[PDB]
Structure formats: structure tokens, C-alpha cells
Amino acid sequence: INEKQMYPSIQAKIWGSLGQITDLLDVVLDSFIKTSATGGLGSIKAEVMADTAVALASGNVKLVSSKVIGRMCKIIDKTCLSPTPTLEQHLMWDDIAILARYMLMLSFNNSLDVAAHLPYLFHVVTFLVATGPLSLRASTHGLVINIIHSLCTCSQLHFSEETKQVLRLSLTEFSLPKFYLLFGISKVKSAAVIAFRSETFALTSLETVTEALLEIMEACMRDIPTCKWLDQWTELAQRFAFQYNPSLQPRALVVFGCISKRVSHGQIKQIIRILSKALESCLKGPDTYNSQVLIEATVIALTKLQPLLNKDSPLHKALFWVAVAVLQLDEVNLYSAGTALLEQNLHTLDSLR
Amino acid sequence: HRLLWNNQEKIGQYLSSRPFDKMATLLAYLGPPEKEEFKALKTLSIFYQAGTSKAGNPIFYYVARRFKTGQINGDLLIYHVLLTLKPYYAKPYEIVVDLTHTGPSNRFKTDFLSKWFVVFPGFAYDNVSAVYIYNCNSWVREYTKYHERLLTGLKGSKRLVFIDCPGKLAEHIEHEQQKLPAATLALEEDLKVFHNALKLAHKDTKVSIKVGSTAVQVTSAERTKVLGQSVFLNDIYYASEIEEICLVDENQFTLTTPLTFMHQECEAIVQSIIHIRTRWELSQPDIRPKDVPGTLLNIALLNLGSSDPSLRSAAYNLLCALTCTFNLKIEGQLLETSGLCIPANNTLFIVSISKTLAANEPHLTLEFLEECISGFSKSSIELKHLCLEYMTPWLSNLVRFCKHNDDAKRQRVTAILDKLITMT
Amino acid sequence: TFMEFASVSNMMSTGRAALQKRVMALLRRIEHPTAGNTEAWEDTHAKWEQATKLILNYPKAKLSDTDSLQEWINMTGFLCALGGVCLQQRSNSTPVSKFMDRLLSLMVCNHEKVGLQIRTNVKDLVGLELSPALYPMLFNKLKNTISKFFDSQGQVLLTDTNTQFVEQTIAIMKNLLDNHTEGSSEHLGQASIETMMLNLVRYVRVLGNMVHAIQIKTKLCQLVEVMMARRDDLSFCQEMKFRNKMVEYLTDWVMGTSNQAADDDVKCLTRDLDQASMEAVVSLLAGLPLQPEEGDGVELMEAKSQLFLKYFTLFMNLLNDCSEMSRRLASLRHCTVLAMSNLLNANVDSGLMHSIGLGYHKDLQTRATFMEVLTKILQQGTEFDTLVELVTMMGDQGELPIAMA
């Protein structure tokens, strides 16, 4: 941190060599994260230590990448012990904010090798979209762009020319002015400029982003036949979907609904009981701002889950009346969700003749 | 489709009434770039009436090497060829075109080509009985193949008659009275004819080479389908523009895309061209697209390390462009994009790319080192540390450019060493 | 046209000005040469000639005639929108020619009694409302109108009337080009826009440094940009010399008193003029190959290299002090950079030779000002060899919505 002028040599000599020593990796990274936390997010120590992690990672990509992703996942999961309204208000928010930029910097040049961690990367992206200050939002966007880039430039997985064209198109699409709004970075000319320096979010946006990423993943699995990405990511979502939490669960429900390919009757029942409990807490509790968003999420999940239940499911018809009851609540966002659910239900029953 | 881009700000509004997202997606691969009066007369006399063929029809001569694109308005030229055709456009005639000493500077634009095709009356084209072409070359082939869709109905017709030697054209001219200017007829006398010269390229052809006292000519003994008729190719490459010459091989020689040929008297050919070019050098009155490679590799590599994210991205894309264009064996990992968040500490990446490029492509190593040492003075302290770190991997390759007997190479190596000494 | 002039009446008119404009808009659409058109236009023009004296020599020899001024405003525009039919009929057969001649005489009129209304009305109606068929005559008359200010040697006869004509004519041409009248395309591209533009530039050269001179120069630069925006619309016998010469003429205008300024307002007008000049130059240079005016026996490469170095140094000097009006100091920076990018993209082998040094550094700006081009200047060396595919297949989608759009 101190010898700024000699930096390009300091890193390449001390850190670039200590990285190639496989056994010391865990201790080095733990000290890195501790020193980053001590400085705090946005600190000179945090920035320097974030940059210095690229140097260590350059040696052993697999181990550093695995340790950096796994600790983020662990912190996110461990957030569900003392739930608080939002993540930005949670106690362990500083840890997530700090460890986020680690993946931001390690994203480039497949220093977060995609072909082993893509499900967890999309997990993080999904849980982080449009969170925190502007810098963190731009960081999440940059992470998405870099991960798609690396997947489009990974030599360890040969892809068809059609798949490569699809990926190139998707990278172009993620740069358009449309996604800047779906990512929370509005009125920012370049994501990069804001990212490398020291608003209400609607779940429809998360649905759009998650669908786009699902297309990006499915085009990839069209080449890697034995891939288990979809199952892994669906499971990691289903862990958070049905588990109570103030901040994570809303996002988790939409992500699960958009992601999953096959549902179960208990899942529909579990979601409906989640909506029931949310509504029951809304009438008694004064924190409507969270129960409402959870109700909307519950509805949005069903609007996607219904087209997948069995042709003999009695719940098809009950879904209509669920939608009617939702529309009876007289909330603009909830009404919109109900109307969407109604359209989906009518279409699904019509297709079933 | 320039207007398709021009009106994308409003086309989406009408489409607001997948298809609905795809209009703006192609903007990634977009951003396209930005009676009559008459005066003057051609002192050059490009198009004129001269000579008559056996069939008793007038023949008009035309030398395309007299006119250069982008200098003289084509309206005047078309009205002029119409004016000189006024007494004869109402009757069937014959045309002969001279394609000697012809290059891309004689290319005819698509708009001017269609203006040529329209202004002449519809019956005058049917009046054309025969078209005679002399000294066809390889540039004309691709010129007309890119303009084939404009001339798709004319290939395969009897009107085109190929002439490679004056005898074939003179057969149908009364007593060989072809009135071509002496400038074109003076290039056939007393050259050297090589019978079995093999033209080495991607597609090997068996041609005949002619090196004279002023220029170098090559004719193709292999029939080439030009406009639907299999004809020979006569390419002329003057020696007044050849400055990349050296002794390379006993049976092969390098000429300038480089030109290579094999023959049993290649040394005599080289000596003849040397003599004529040195005579031309006696007659003198009182950046190239090769040195681009290293001089730009340095500009990309130094700027990657910069401390402005936009500049890093810009330089990365420049690297992708350079590697793709020049086919550098970097493992082809890099792919262009926009908006990449390239990390600040890219010292290891730049250094690894430099090492791989130095090992895989030890080609320039002199332009590159010259540029790096030149830019090492102006860089920052941190940038100086970066610069040395990737400069180091290249100095080893300098051993190669010491053994060669090229005083230009040796003096350059000495200059690089003296610059490094001054830096030390 | 008559049938349309029934929907033109059924719809509610929110006053007379809009009804007058709607009437002229329909009159411009009058194309077929019927006989009543002829007599109506001719007799209206006769009454207009009488009212010319009655309104112009009769504030002088004697107000309540503001009503007649308002009538005149309408009647002039009437003649302007219906001028075209008569000229069309001349081609298949000269008062119409005399119409503009009076109009141009009215153009600089100074009257003791509100001539300002007269000038403003002539400007507005002549610019916006004249029929496109009337364009060729307009240009042909303006050419010789401007050609009478320079002497045989090329010495400009600078006069107050002349300058008043020039400010106006440039304003009028700007207003004309700005509006895309229907059919204007096929009528704009017969007369050349070269000579009057050139002469106006030569006259504005000597305008001096007064507030009026700078205000005129800024408007002229806006006109140059607007005219350049439609190199397609106009017809040029020689675009190359055109652009090259006036590029060489506007190069001078930039950085005129950017360091010797003594007043905030004077530098503000100077900064505005420099910004406008740079904007115009950027527009000129797009695709403009350099070909210097015949030199002193210099090989074309040698002259092109010197011209390029001159331009490039002129640009670098401006960009060198562009660091450290705070909005201007950055806007004129990207304008200066885009100008240079325009030079290079056109001029490859007169470029990189003097341009490679721009790749190197700065005060965090020049690399971000040359690689600010290399994004599409030197990485534009892709497939230059000295693309656009599947954009047709997307337009063939069901119901053909894009083509209808």
C-alpha cells in the first residue's frame, strides 16, 4: 500500500511470486480480506488490496477464483441469520461490498474462470443487481459485461460459430441504453468511468435481467452436453426462495421462477402459503414496504411457474381466483402483477383446451 | 441503409405499436461513415476516332492510363465522349480499348459507370458490333467482378474479343493499320521472354515473364476465365516502383505484397532490373503499411497500463484490431468489445502478451524496440517500471539481427544500443 | 390542390397568421399550369407593384397603414408561393424575374417609418415560403448580386449597404436550407452553391473584429455547417476544391483573439466564434481528401504532407491549451479532436507519418484525445486494405413493419 511509485515492480515481484505458492494461498487471501475490511469500503487500503488480488490470482486461477467466489456465497447465505429489511442495512453489508470489487477486478481475462463458476457468478449478479451506491451498481454491470466477455473468449470450451455469434450479440445488447435502466445505472455515460473511482428497484427489472442471463446460459449449454449449470443455479436459488428473509427472498422468488424448468405441487403450495403469511403480516404489521414487495414477488413467481404444472393440476383454476383476490387488494404494482397473472392463466387454460 | 441509421430515433416510435428489440441491437455493428454547359478540351486526346477494321467500321481508341480518378469532373468526360460520338453514334461502329499501364487510378466509379451506361442511347449499344480488349491484367478481373452485377448481361458475349499480341487484333484491321499511340507499341520491342517461369503464390500458375529496359511484364500461358471467356493474363509491374530487392535464394528471388518467381536465370533477371533501375535513379532530378506493426504494438502496450479506464479499453480494442489484422500468434484469445472494465493492475497481462508475442512473432523487434526506447523517456515513473518489464523480453531476439550482412540492420542495432546506454 | 383546399378550410384556423401560412402552403402545391392561375398571379403582382409605391414611397410623401403593411405581408407571400407556375409556363412558352429584382431591392431598404418590419418580413417570407421551382432564379440572381461587391482585382467594395445585404443574405440562406420543403431536392440541385458561398466568405474575411463582425461570422459558420449537411441535396461540379479552399479559409478563423482578449464579453463572442468555426471545419473535413492548389513544382505527396502538417499543428496548438468557458474548454476539446479524426480517416498516407506522435502522452488528455480517435481511426485500419451483413434479412420480418415504419 505504501510504496506507490514502485508499484508495478512491487506487485510483479512480491505478489506475483507469492501467488504461485499454492499452499500459502488461503492465508494470503484471508489477510487480504481482513486488511480490506479494516480500511473499509471506498478506502485507499481497500482499493489497493483489490487491485493487488489480480496479481495473486494471475498465478493460480482456480484456487484464488474458488476462494473469492465461495466466500461471497458464504457471506450472502450467512446474511439469513439476523434478517433485516434490506441488504444495505444488514450488519454484514460491508463484507459483501468489499468482496464484490474483488470479483470485479478478477473478472477480466477470465481470472474468474467461467467454465467452473458460472452458476455462482449469475447467483451473485442476480442478488446484487441495482444495490448500494452508484459505484457498486456500475461494478455489477461491469461484472456482467466481463463475465459474458470471458465466456465468449474461453479457450477451455470450444463453441460453435452460431453460439459465438449469439454471445457476441448478447455482449452488444448488454451495452445498450435499455439495460442501463434495468441495472440502476441511469444518467451514467460509461459504466467503466464510474466503476473505477473512490432509487427504487422494481422486480420486473430483475425478471428482465434474469431472463436475459438465462438465454445467455442456455445458448452456452447448447454446446457443453454434460453441463449441470442450470440444475446448480436452480438449486442455489431454491435454497433462498422458500427460506424466510426480508431482503433476499423477494429477489430469490423472481429469480427462481424465471430460472426453473419444472415445478412441484408443494412448491406452488409453499409459495401460496408464503403469500398468505405476507398478506397476514401486511394487515397487522406497519412495515408494508417489504410485505407488499414480497406479495408482488409471490405473484410474479406464479405468473411464471403456472405454465409448467401438470395438465391435471387442479391449481390451474384456483390460480384465476388467486389473481382476482390479488387485484382486489387495490395496489398499483400488485394490480399490475395480478393482471399479468390473469393473462398468463387464461392463456395457459386456453392452450390446454 | 445510411438513412436506416439516420431515422432510428423515430422508427422505434412507430414500432412501439424478438422483433421489438432488434432494431437497436444492430447499432453495435453500425455507425457507417459520411442540355448542359461544357468547357475545356482534353489535350491528352484520350478518346478519339482512329483507324478502320476489315469490316469497314470505324474504331475509337481509348487509353485509360491518361485519366486519374478524383481530379477531373466526370460530367465533362461523359459529355465529351458523347460529343466526339455525335457524327458516328447513329450508325453501327467498332470499339477498341487500351488497357496498358493501367492501375486502380484508372478505376471507374459505380455512379460514373451507370452514367456511362445511361447517357449513351439505347440503340448505340446494339450498334456495337465488336469490342476489342488489349493487355488484360489481374486488377481488371477483380474490378469487373466487383462490378459484375452492373455488367452481368455482357459477360459471355461475342462482342468482347481478347487481344494479347498485336497480331491477333491486326488480323481484323485492314493491313494492320491500328493507330494506337507509339507509347503503348514501344513496350513490346526487344524484351526477354522466359518460357516456363512459375509464378509462386497461393494459386500456382504457369506464366511467362518479360523483363525489359523500363518495366517488368508477365503474361499467363494459362487460360483464365475473364467475363466468361478463358483468356490469358498480361500483368505489367514497372521497375520504377520496386525498391524491395535483395539476393535471397539461388533459384528464387523476392520482388515488390511480395512477388516471387523461379527460373534458371533469375540472377540475370535481377541484374537487368538493377541496371535499369539504377539508370532510372541516374535520371532523378536535382509511413508504410509494414512498419505499422511494431510502431503500433508499442502504442497499444504502453497505453494499456494507463490510469484512465477508457484509455485501457481503447488500447485493448486497438490490440485486438492489430492482432486480428496482422495475424499475430497471441493465441487469438483477445476479442474486441466496448465498455470493458479492464482492471487497473494489468502489468502481468501486458507482460505476458509481450512475452508471447516476442516468442511467437520475432519479426520486427527493431521498430518495436526503437519505439519503446523512444517512449520510455516520456513515460511516468510507474509507466517507466512497466515499460522496462515488457521491453526486457524482446532484447533477446536482437541476436538474430546481428549476423546478417545488412549495414542498415547493424547501424540500427548500434543506435538501439546507444539509446539504451543513454537511458542507463 | 383545390380538393385539398377544402380540408384546409373545414379545419379550424386559430387566427389569420396560420390561415395565411396554410394558404401559402397550398399555393406552393399548385403545380399544374392552369390559365386562371396566370391571370390571377399577374394581376395580383400588378396590384402588388402599385402597393409597392403606396407602402414604400408613401410613408415618405404625406401610421394607420399598419393594416396595409399586414396586407402586404400576406400579398408578398401569396406571390412567392404562387411564383413558380409562371416560370414553369415560361419553359413551355419576364415579370417574375423582375419580381425578385424588386424583392432584392427591398432587401436592404432603410425607411424613416418602420423599415424594420419590411426587412424582417422579406427575410421570413423569402426564406420559408418561396416555391422550390423558384430556387434556380433565386440563386442566379443572388450570385450576381454578391458578385458586384468585389473589384476586378478581387478587392471588396466594403459598404454599409453591402454588409447589410450580406448579413441578411446569409441569414436568408440559412433559413432556406434549414427547412426541408417538399420537392426542394429536385430543384435545389441545379444551381451551384459554390460562388456565392465563396464570395460571402471572402467578404466576411474583411469584416474586422467588431461585435457585428463576430456575430456575422458565427451565423456564417452555422450556414456553412447547414449547407455541408446536404452535400447530397446540392449538385457540385467540383466538391473537392470547394471544401479544400474554404477549409483553408476557416482554418484562419479559429484562435483569433483567444489569448489577446481584454474583455469577458469580447472573449465570450470570440469563444463562440471559435466553437462555431471548429464545428464547421469538422463538418467540412468529413471525407475530404486533401489536394493542394497547384504548387511550386512539388510532388503531390510533398505538398500534401506540408498541408497536413500545417493543419495538424494548427489543431494541436489549440488542443495543447485546451487543458486547465469551463464548458467551452471541454466542448472545444472534443470538437478539435473530432476535426483531427476527420483529417486522418480521409488522409491515410499523409497522416500516421505526422500522427503517430499523438499516440503518446499528455496531461491525461492527448492519448485520450488521439486514442479518442483510434477507437475508430487507427483501429479503423480494419479492412481498409489500402462489414454490413444480415441487416437486410432482419428487415424481411413478418408483416414488414420496418419498411412501413
From Swiss-Prot, chain B:
<feature type="region of interest" description="Lipid binding">
    <location>
        <begin position="35"/>
        <end position="286"/>
    </location>
</feature>
<feature type="domain" description="CRAL-TRIO">
    <location>
        <begin position="35"/>
        <end position="192"/>
    </location>
</feature>
<comment type="function">
    <text>Stimulates the GTPase activity of Ras. NF1 shows greater affinity for Ras GAP, but lower specific activity. May be a regulator of Ras activity.</text>
</comment>
<protein>
    <recommendedName>
        <fullName>Neurofibromin</fullName>
    </recommendedName>
</protein>
<comment type="subunit">
    <text>Interacts with HTR6. Interacts with SPRED2.</text>
</comment>
